Every structure is written in C-alpha cells, then in structure tokens.
C-alpha cells in the first residue's frame, strides 16, 4: 500500500510522474475476482471434494496445526498454494493493468 | 562563433550510451547543426532521435562520436552546416571543426603543414644508426 | 582547561559543564568519541538509563531477602538472586519448558516501553525535540512544582544515588557468585568464605572457571 | 502514460529514469541507508553499516567453516569473521591514502579526513556486531541451529 | 610513506620502547605464572579433532601445540586486537602510531633525555630505551647460556619469582 | 599520442583526409605533385590509430605513416 | 623434527601477512601521482 | 508540539485532532506507511465487528436460541464454529457479510476520493445523532467502545483457549 485509491502522500512511479496503484481496489478486487471462481468444487484427491481456494485454506489450517513442522513433499499444500498463488498474480496483474489503465 | 549554450537540442528519449562522469569532470564535445526540417535521425550513441527544425545541439563524450553524427547528417540530410566543439569543465569552449571555416579536405591558404617529411619513406634512417642518440629516424 | 575532578589533567572537551551530573571526570574523553552534537545527550541518557534500572535492581535484591510475595517460594524453592532468573527461565516455554512466564511476560511488557522511548531517544539525538536527557514525564505526584523535568538539586540526586546503585548492585551481584548469600545474609556475615550457602551455577558459567586454576579458590 | 525518461532531464547523459532507479520508494531507501542519510558525520555512517555488516558475517563462517562440526565453531567463526574485518578494514586503510589528497574539511565521505573517519567507524561497528552476533548465538538455542531445535 | 613517522623516529623510538617496557613486564609474569603451575592444564596437547590441523606442530610425539602455548598465543591475541583498534580509531588524547604528514617532529633526545622525576614523554623515552636493551640482552643470554628464558628471568632476578 | 608523418610521394588525392574518424588530417598547398597539395597532420593529438587513413592511401607504400606510441584518454577511444 | 613450532609460526607469516603486506605497499607505490 | 499520550513523543503529524479518538498515539509512526482516512475506516469496522464479538461471546454463555442446543452440546464458543460450519450457519453469515462488503468497496473508494468520511454509511434510523452535540459523543464513545471491544474478544477467545469455559464462566469459577 504504496499508495491508495486518494491523493495522500506525493507518489511518483518514477522520477516525475505520480502514479495512483490501487493496492487496496486492485488488491482486494483481484484476491475476490480469483477467489469466487476458485471455490467451484471437485472430486479430485488433491482438492478432495472442495474448491482450489476452499482447500488451499484447509490445508493452511493443516500444516498450521503441526506448526514447526514443515508440509512434506507429497503434501497437497505445495501444489494447492502454488496454483492458488499463481492465479491470484495472474488477476492481480491483469486487475492492475484493466483498472490503472482503462481507468473504467 | 561561441557556442550558443541555449541552442534547443534534438528531441530524445534518453538512453544508457551518453556521456558518464568523466564527461563533467574531463572534457565534453557539443556538435551543432541546422536542419530544414523535422525529422529523424540515429544517435551514435544508441537509439534514434528527432532533429528540430532550425538549430540543433548535442553533448557527446568523444570527438569520434560527433564526427560519426556529423558524416551522417551530410550524407543523408545533406547538412554541412555542422560545428564541433570541445568544452572543458572550467566552462572553456574549443572550436574544433570545420578548424578554419573550410573542410579539412578542401585545401586553404594560411594551412601550415604538420608532419611532412621530405623524402620517401624507404629512405628513414636505420634504428642502429640513432641508437643512444636523440636524432629522429626520418632522416 | 583543568578537570575539577582530576586537578591536574585537562578539562573533557565536549563535557559542557551545564550539565547535571557533572565533576569533569571524562579521562578517557568518550564523550568526544563520536563528533555529533547529539552524543553527549545519548550518553547522558544512557547513564540515567543505567542507574533507574540499577536503583531497583539493588532495593529489589534487599527486598527479596526481606521477604516475598505469597507463593513465590513454593514455586521457586529456595533459590535467591540471580539464580530466580535462571530458575523461572527453566520453568518457561521457549527458554525451558513450564507453565510459568514472568521472565518472558517482564520483558514484553519492558520491550513496549523501550521501543517507545526508543524513537524518543532518536528524535532527541538528530535535535528534532527539545526534551533532555532522561525527561520522559513522569511526575504523578506533584514534586517539581509544575515541571517533570524537576529541579537541578534533585537531578543531581537522582545521578548519584544512580551511579551509587550501579556500584552496588554490581558487588551485590559479584558477591551472591561466591558467597551465594545474598545482599542481608553477606552483610551479616562480615568475615565470609568461612561460611558459603550454596548456589546454583549461572546460565553464563564459563566465566566462573579461572577461580580454581589462576585465582586462589577460598570459597 | 510513460515510465521511463530521460535522467535528472537530461537526455544525454548515460543514465535513465526507471522505476528502480528513481521511483518514490527507491528514493525514500537510499536517501534514508547510512551512506546517504544526512545529519550523519561520517564516522556515524561507518558505524551503522559497520555494525550491519559485522553482525551478518559471523553466520557462515560458523555454520560453513571447517571447525562448523566442532564445539569450537563459534569461537571460529567469530575468529574468522574478525579476521576478514581486519582485511577489509586494510582494504579501507589503503583506499583512502590513494584515493583522497589531504584538506581541511571533515565533513564529507569523500574527503581523506573523512574516509578515516569511515574506517574507524567500520572497524569499531564491525567488531561490535560481530560480538553482538556472537553473544546472541552462543546463548539462544535457536540460533545455533537454524530453528532445528523446535522439531 | 615515511614521511608518516615511520623509519627510525622519535615517534617509532617511542611506540617500539612501550612495546617492549609491555614485554619485559610480560616475560617476568609469564616465567612466574609458569612456576607456581598457574596456567591451566598447560602440559596437555589441543587435540586436532577438536581444534584443526592448525594445532599440529609435527613434533616427533603427539604432533600437536601444548595448551600452555596456546594460552599465551591468545593472551597476545587479545593486546593485538586493542591495538589494531587503537591504530584506526585512537583515543582523541592518545598519541598515533602515523603521523598526519604535516607534523613537526619532535626533537631527537640525543645521549640524554633532561631528567624528569615525574611521569612525562623524557622518562618514558628513559625507559622504553632501556627495556629495548633489556629485551636484547635476556635473550641473547638465553641463547649464549642455553637456558630458556624464563630460567634467565628467573636467574637475573634472583629466584624472586620462583 | 600517436605519431603521424606524411611523406613526399604524396600524390594529393585527399583520401586520407576524408577517411579520418577524427580530422586529424587536412589538405595544404604544395608544388611537389600534380595535385598542387600533400596531406598534412597537424591535430595528431586526437589520432585514435584507426589507421584508415593507412588503408585510403594509394602510394605504393604508404604516403601516410601512423605511429602508435604513448596512449592517453583520446588516443585509446575511452567514452570514460 | 627439530625446532618443530618453525613451521607453524612461519608458514602463516610467510604464505598470508608477507604477500598481504606486498599487496598492500605495492598497491599504494603504483597508485601515487609522486 | 508534543504527543498528548506519550508526552517524550513528537506529535504525529499525519494525526489532527478533530479525528474521533484522537489521542496522539502513533509512536511507530504507522500514519506515515498509509493514507490516514484508510486507517481510519479500518479502526472502525475492526471496532464494530470486534464490539458484535464481545458481546456475543457474553450472551451466548447467557442463553442460547431455541433448538440451538441440540446441534452443539458442549462447545462454547471458538468450537461452535467448526460444527456450524458444516451446519452452514457460519457460511449463510459469511455470505451476507461479504454481500454487503462489496457495497463497502464501492464506499471506501468515496472516502479515498474524498467525498464520504470515513466509517459513515449514514445508518441512523432512529435519529440518535439529530442534536449534533450527541453526535460528537456518539461519535467518540463507538471509536472508545470499540478499541475496548477489540482487546476484550482477544482477552477472552485466548481465556476461552485455556479455561475452556468462556467469559462468564471463568469469571464465576477459576
Ligand atoms: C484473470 C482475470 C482477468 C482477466 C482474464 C481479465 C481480462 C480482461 N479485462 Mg479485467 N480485471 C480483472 C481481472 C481480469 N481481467 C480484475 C481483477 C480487475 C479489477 C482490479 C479487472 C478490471 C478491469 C477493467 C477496469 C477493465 C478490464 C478489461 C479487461 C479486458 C482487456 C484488458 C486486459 O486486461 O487485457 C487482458 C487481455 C486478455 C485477458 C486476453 C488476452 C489473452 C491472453 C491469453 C491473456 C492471458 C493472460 C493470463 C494467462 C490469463 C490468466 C487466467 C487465469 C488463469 C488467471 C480483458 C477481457 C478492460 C475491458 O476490456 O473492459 C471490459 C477494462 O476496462 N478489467
Ligand atoms: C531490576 C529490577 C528487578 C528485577 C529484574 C526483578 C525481577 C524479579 N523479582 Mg524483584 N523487585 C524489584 C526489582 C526487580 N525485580 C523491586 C524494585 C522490588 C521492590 C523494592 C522487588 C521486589 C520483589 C519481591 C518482593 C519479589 C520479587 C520477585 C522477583 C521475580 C519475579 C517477578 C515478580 O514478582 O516481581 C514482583 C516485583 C514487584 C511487584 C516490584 C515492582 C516495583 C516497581 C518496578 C518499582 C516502581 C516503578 C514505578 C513506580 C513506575 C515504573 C514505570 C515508570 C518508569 C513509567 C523476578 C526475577 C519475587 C521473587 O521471585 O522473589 C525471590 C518476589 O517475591 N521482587
Ligand atoms: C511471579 C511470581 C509469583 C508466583 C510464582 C506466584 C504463585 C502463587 N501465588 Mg502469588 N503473588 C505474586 C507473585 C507470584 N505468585 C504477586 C506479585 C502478588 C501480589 C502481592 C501475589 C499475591 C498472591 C496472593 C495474595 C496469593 C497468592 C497465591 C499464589 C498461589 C496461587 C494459588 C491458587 O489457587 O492460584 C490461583 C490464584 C489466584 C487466582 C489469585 C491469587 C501460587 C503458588 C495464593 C496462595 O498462596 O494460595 C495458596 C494467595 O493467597 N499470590
Ligand atoms: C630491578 C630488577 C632486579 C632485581 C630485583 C634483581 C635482584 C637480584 N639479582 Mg639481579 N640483575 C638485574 C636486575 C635485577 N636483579 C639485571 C638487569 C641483570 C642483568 C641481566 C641482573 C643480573 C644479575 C646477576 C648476574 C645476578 C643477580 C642476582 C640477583 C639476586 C641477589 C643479588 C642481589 O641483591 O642483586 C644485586 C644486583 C645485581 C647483581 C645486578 C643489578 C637479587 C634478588 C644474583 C643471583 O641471585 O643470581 C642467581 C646474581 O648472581 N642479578
Ligand atoms: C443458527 C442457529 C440455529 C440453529 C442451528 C437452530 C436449530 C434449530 N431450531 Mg432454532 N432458532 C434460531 C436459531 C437456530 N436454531 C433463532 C435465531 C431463532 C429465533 C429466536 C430460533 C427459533 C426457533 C424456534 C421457535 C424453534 C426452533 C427450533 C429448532 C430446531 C428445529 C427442529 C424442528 O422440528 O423444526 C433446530 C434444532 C424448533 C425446536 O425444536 O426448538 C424448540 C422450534 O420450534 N428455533
Ligand atoms: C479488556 C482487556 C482484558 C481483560 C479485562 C482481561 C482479563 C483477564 N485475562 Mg485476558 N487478555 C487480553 C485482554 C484482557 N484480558 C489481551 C488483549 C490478551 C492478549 C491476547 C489477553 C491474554 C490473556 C491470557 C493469555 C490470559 C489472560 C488472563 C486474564 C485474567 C487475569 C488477569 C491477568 O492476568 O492480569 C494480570 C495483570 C497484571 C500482572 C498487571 C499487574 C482476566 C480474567 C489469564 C487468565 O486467568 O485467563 C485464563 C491468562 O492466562 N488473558
Ligand atoms: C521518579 C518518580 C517516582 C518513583 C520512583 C522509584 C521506584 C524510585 C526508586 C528509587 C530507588 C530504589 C533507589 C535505590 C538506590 C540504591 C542505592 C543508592 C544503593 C546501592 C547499594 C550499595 C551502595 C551497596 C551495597 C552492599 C555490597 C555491595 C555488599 C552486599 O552484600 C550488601 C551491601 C548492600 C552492604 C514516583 C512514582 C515516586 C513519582 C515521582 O513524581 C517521580
Ligand atoms: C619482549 C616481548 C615483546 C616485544 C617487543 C619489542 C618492541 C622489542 C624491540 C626491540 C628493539 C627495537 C631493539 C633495538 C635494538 C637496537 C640496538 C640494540 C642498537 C643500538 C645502537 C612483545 C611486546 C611482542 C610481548 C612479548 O610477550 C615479549
Ligand atoms: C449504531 C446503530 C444501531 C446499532 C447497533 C449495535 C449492534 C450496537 C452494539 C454495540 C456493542 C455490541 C458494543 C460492545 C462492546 C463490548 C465491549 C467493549 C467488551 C467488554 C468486555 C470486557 C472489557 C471484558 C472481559 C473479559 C476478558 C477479556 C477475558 C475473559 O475470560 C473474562 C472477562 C469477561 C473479564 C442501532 C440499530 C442501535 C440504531 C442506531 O441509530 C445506529
Ligand atoms: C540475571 C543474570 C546475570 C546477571 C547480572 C548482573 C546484574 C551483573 C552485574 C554486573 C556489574 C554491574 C558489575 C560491576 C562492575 C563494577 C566494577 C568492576 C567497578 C566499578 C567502579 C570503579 C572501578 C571505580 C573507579 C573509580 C573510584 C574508586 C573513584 C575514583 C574515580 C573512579 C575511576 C571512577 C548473570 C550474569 C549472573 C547470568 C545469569 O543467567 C542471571
Ligand atoms: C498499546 C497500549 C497497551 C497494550 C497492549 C497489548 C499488547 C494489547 C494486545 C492485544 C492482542 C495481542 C490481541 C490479540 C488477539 C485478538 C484476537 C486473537 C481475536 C481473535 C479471534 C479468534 C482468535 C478466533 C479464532 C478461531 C475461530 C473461532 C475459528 C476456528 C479457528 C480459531 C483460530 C480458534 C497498554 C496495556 C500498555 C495500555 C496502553 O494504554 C496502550
Ligand atoms: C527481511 C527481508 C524481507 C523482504 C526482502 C528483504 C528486504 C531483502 C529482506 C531483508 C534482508 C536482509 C538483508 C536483512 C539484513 C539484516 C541485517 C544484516 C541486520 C543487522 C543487524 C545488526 C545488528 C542488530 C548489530 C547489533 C550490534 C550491536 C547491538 C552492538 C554490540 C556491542 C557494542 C559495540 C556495544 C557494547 C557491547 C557489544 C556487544 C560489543
């Protein structure tokens, strides 16, 4: 949060130009955006019967648990965490350049 | 004949290949020309840049690189109306070329000659015979 | 220039003489070690930080003697100055394991306090605030007439008495390491290392070594 | 909108404005690190990267060094550390006698005076967090590891 | 270069005779903490595995540096310490082993330095010349006679020390 | 800086002259050849020692003689 | 080996501060204007 | 000027005193790091939800609704969650909130604009603000209220994850 949706402190991108980043209309739009979609359950070991998003929570409840202890190898956390993180880039950046940009 | 330091220079972007800190601490060169036109052209630093019609200038960091734009714009644009300059950091401006009004390979009274040695050159001294002796090997 | 303190050696440079606390006693000239005008206030801060702390230090040694709050000693045992410290760590999650937490609850508590006073101590160093050193407001009780800074008189008190503690608390501390018999107990015994109460070993115990082998052991 | 121009407004100096090079933030850290931070003498400003620098070099000599297996590698490693701080504090010695001819001001880095001044902050910050480092690993199980003590 | 203080010096007389007043003092402390056994388990040999291959010293048993060897390697590693910090950051009073280069030397003492009672640069040049002797003479006593050198300490101070 | 020298079976064909990366080189009147002038070498200081003008030069063996000696800043084409 | 500790004194002496003292003068000889 | 809480302090200039609950207090200097009408709006709907906490962990050790018994026995009130969960209660909650949360974006872009102050969603059906000199009151005593509200749920899910018990239980037996 850089800079917010306001004229607050006198932000430049780069040496002259202010720029507005929307980290909280583009953050919290993108994390939304991706997350609704997401939740679309399957019947697949690696969500087991939840969405991306819903399992990718659960198995931060899971790990989380067993705290010091890292997930393993096989563990479901690194492939729902890496595809769930993947996807929330790709809509961050995209949300960055469709509202910076098209400004509407 | 000084160089007008409020001449406008060409229209740029900016690039990595200017001049760097020995520019403003060593010597600069500045090179002005006119041009009829708005158009462009290709800096011999990088990238390409927009002559302004009227007056233009520039800064390079070596004598080569104003000389490189130079042939350039005379033989593409066929602007031969280009002064180079040397400026030193004490704010001290060299002319340096065309060095007299006219181009080197026009010949020009007043031109004294440097470095014309006499004789041809098979006929330089043996290294043997100015050895441990200042005399210069031609003749 | 010539020291109060020293007669013969020359005054300490940077040492204003303005300043509370001050005999000329600079020898060494740390005080000219760092050129920034702000040094001077840091050291004078950290003195006064030094001696608050050591003032309770060595009346809360006194008082542990005197007696303790209820339950203590059952938990505790018997143990009596630093080896408390020692002992509640044992008895606490991530130094030890136990259900107790004072040590680590002090210094969470402390640790606030310090990062505030922190930025304080910054601020008063680069010479954005006005606040002298170790002027932190605190005067509940009325005792300075209408200023927490207090009066001359009184802060050269509050300096000595905390210079006074820091040497104290120190022998105190020096003393429970051999003796192991506590501020009270060492007092009244007079000719000690006839008598030693045991203790446990410190949680630095590599610096209790060269007592046998270079120095004499009496204990 | 354009991100990328000419340096400080010049198009033909060998430098371009980027975002990395000149954006609010990037300006905000470098004017804010010791090297640039004004109000700091530059005695202070080698005592800040000094205590930096000293602090995070006894990590791999310990963790990495021969003597690492040993009960010793503490010890060694601040040993070590030590000893490439007293190399590079020559290093520093040797710049500053070529480097700078000498004048009155103090003021600035870039001055003999001043790059003294530098030296012995880094010698005496190094030294200081190097021990600060050392004190902190030889009494905190968890450092001693690299967290391994909590499985 | 040498312009700094360094080559033969008042200033280099003076740093290299406090140096040797310190070794003297020390040669004495060692031979007399040796001969009560005040240093700690001076006989055993550091063991490679716990201290490196640079303990080894291919002796023809053991192969390995005394712990008493050791000791007093450290005891001169903690004084050169101070005083590679003492030459790069001295003390704002402290006298400095360089010269700043525009510095008036002070004059050579000659045969005789004027006698001073009192603690000043004229006695401290008295003795850091005589202590660099001194140091000469125990040990080419010691190498002449073919004791070491603590006997040699020893002896020249009467058995006083042990 | 580099050593230029222009010798007398100069034919005065320029060449030298406009080939130059640096304008070292100019023309002045002579009678010798039929061209009425030599090439001449009066600003070697800025002489990079391309040798291009070596590489115009027509003569059988070169009129025009460059001679790398002592570099400095322009003579070694630093832009820094 | 006879006279043993010689070549654990001056091997370091001679393989490290020798050449750093080298380095270091030599450096500052080719690096001076006069 | 100084800090009115932590007096030694400078006063943090992103903070004015006009703002609802304005103490002084900002010693990490945390105004700087973000726009403040962010921050404000933030301290707000952190204080209503965590003062909607509070009081339901009190009622809920009270009395609980009709039937609700037979679907939790003996959880009190971290594990209700979990069984609600599958229950659905938690994800119909969950979804209203979050349905009026999307109108929430559309008003903190208001505020970052400038137009709406922040916190403000002009609910007052009763028209307990109309006087104007109850609203700075009201005003004040929502930020207090709250900040008390936030360190009371935290204070009492954390006794709740250790005596579990909940709140009033602990209180009648330690
Ligand atoms: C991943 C999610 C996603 C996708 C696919 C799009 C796609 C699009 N947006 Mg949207 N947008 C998003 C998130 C997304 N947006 C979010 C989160 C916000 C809010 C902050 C916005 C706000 C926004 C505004 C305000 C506007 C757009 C507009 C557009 C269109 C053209 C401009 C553009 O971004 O080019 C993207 C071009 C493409 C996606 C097509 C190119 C095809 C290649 C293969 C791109 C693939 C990229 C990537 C691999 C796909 C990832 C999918 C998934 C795995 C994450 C395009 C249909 C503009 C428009 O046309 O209006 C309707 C417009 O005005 N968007
Ligand atoms: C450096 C100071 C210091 C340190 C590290 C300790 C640490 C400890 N003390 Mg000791 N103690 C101290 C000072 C200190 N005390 C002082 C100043 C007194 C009163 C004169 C006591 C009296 C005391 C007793 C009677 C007992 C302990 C005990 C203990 C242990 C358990 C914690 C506890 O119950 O403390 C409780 C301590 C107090 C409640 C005294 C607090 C007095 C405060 C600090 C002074 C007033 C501060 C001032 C008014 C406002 C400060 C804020 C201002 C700067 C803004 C712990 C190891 C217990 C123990 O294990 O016995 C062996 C125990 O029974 N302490
Ligand atoms: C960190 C130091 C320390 C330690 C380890 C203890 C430990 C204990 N205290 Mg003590 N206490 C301390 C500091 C400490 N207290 C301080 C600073 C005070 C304030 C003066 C008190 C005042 C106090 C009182 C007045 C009483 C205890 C009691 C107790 C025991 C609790 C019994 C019980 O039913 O628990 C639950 C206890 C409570 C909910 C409140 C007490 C326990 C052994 C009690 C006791 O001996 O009963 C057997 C008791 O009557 N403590
Ligand atoms: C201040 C230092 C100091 C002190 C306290 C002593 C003390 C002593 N030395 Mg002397 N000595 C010293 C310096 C000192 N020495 C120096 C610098 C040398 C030259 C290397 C000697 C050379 C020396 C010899 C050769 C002998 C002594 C001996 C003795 C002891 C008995 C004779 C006597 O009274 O000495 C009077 C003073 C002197 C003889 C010299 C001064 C006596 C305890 C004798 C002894 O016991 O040897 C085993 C003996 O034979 N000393
Ligand atoms: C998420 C919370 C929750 C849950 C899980 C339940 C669950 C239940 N309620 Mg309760 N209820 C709730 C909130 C809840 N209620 C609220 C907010 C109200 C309004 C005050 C009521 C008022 C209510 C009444 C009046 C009755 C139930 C009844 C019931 C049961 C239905 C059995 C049947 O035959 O029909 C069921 C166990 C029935 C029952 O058996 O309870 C006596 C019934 O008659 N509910
Ligand atoms: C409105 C704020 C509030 C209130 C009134 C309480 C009140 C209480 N808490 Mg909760 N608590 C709070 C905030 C609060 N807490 C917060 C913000 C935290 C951090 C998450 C905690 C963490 C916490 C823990 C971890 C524990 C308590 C405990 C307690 C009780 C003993 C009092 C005590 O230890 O003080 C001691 C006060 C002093 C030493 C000052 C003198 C008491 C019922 C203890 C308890 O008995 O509950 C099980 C306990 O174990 N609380
Ligand atoms: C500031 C402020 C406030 C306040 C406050 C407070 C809490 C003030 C507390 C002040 C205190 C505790 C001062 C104590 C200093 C201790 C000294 C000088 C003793 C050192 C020991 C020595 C010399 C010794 C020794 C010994 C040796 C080594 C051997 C030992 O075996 C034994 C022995 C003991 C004999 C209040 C709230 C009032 C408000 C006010 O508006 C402003
Ligand atoms: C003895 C000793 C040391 C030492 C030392 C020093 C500085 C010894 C210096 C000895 C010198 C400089 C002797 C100069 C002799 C010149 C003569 C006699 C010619 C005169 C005409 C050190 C400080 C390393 C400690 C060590 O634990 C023992
Ligand atoms: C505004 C708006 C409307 C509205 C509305 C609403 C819904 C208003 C609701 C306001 C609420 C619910 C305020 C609640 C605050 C609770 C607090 C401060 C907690 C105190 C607990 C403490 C200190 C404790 C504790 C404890 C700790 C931590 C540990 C425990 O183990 C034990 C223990 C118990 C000791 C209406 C409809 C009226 C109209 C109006 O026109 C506009
Ligand atoms: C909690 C915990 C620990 C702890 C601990 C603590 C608190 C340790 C305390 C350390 C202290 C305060 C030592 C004091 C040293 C003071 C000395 C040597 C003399 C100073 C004055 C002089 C020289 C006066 C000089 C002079 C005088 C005479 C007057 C003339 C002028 C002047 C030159 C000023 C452990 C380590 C046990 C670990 C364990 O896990 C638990
Ligand atoms: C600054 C300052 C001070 C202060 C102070 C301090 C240090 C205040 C500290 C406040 C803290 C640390 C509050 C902590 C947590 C709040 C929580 C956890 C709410 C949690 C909801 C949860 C856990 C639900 C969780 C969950 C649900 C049900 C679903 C299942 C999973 C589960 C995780 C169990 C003072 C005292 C000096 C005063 C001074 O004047 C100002
Ligand atoms: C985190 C992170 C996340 C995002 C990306 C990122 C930014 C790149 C990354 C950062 C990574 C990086 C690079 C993080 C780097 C972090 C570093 C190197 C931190 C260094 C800290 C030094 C300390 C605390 C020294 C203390 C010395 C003291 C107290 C003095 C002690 C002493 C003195 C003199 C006084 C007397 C006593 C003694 C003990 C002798």
Redesign the interface.
Known sequence: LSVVAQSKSDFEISDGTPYTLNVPLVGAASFIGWVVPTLLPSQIALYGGKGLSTAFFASIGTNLAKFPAPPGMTDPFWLLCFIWHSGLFATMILGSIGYNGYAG | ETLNLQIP?P????????????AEV?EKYAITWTSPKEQVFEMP?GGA?IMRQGENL????????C??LATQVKNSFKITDYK?YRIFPSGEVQY??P?DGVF??????G????????????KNLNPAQIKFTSKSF?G | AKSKAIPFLDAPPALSESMPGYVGFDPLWVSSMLPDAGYVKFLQEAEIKHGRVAMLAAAGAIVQDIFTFPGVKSVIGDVKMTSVHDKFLSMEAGSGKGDMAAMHQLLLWLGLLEIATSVAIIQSFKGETSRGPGEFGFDPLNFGKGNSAGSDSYKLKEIKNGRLAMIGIGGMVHHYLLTGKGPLQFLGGIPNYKSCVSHPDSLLPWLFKAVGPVLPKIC | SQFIKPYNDDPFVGNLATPVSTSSFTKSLLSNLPAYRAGLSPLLRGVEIGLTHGYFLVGPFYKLGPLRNSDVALLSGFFSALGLIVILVACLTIYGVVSFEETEAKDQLQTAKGWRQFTSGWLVGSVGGASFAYILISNIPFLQTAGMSML | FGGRGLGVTVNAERWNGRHAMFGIFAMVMTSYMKGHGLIPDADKVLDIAQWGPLAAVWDGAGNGISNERAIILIAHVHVLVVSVIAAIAPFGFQDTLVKEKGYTPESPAGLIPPFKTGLTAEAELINGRLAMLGVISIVTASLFTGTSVVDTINLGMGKILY | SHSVKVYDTCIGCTQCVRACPCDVLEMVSWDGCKAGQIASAPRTEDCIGCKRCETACPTDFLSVRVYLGGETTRSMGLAY | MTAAYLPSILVPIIGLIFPGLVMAFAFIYIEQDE | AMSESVPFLKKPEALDSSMAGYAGFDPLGLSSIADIKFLQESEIKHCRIAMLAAAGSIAQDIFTFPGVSKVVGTAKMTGVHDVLVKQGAMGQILLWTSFLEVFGTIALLETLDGKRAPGDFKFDPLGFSKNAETAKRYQLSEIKNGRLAMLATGGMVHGYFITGKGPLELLTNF
């Open positions: 220079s229209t740029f972007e900016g690039s990595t290949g200017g001049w760097l800190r020995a060593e630093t840049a520039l800064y390079l960091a070596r004598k080569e690189q000389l490189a180079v340096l070329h060095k080197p390979e026009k010949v020009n009274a031109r004294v000659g440097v470095g014309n040695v006499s004789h041809s050159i098979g031609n």
